[PDB]
Amino acid sequence: VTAADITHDGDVEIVKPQHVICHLTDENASISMRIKVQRGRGYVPASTRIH
DNA sequence: ACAACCTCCTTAGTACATGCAACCATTATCACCGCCAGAGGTAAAATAGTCAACACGCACGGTGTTAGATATTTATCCCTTGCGGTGATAGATT
Length: 51
Prior knowledge:
The protein is mostly loops. 0% of the residues lie in helices and 0% in strands.
């Protein structure tokens, strides 16, 4: 599961093709997800975003 | 006939390795003093010379003027700043 398996739900370049995520094994297998992405320029903890 | 063995005898052979700092004393003991050496002293003359005299003659340095350089002043010029517009990067793909 790879960059060649993405779809662009927004404005996103991808200078990370080699970032393989996971795998599948059968001729009828599947997996799907959404992903949220951000740029900003500073840091906050995942469970101290607070408001 | 000797052999080593029992006992405490004494002897004496050794005592690991790397490095830095400190300074170099104690003795008493007649060396006599007699002789004379070449050998210390110094007067007078060799191996040769001083420095004062009157000359000789020159260099150097300080006072003076000149020279020109320099550091200032002025003002010019360019290279740089910072922001901005929008650049073909980085690098993923063909």
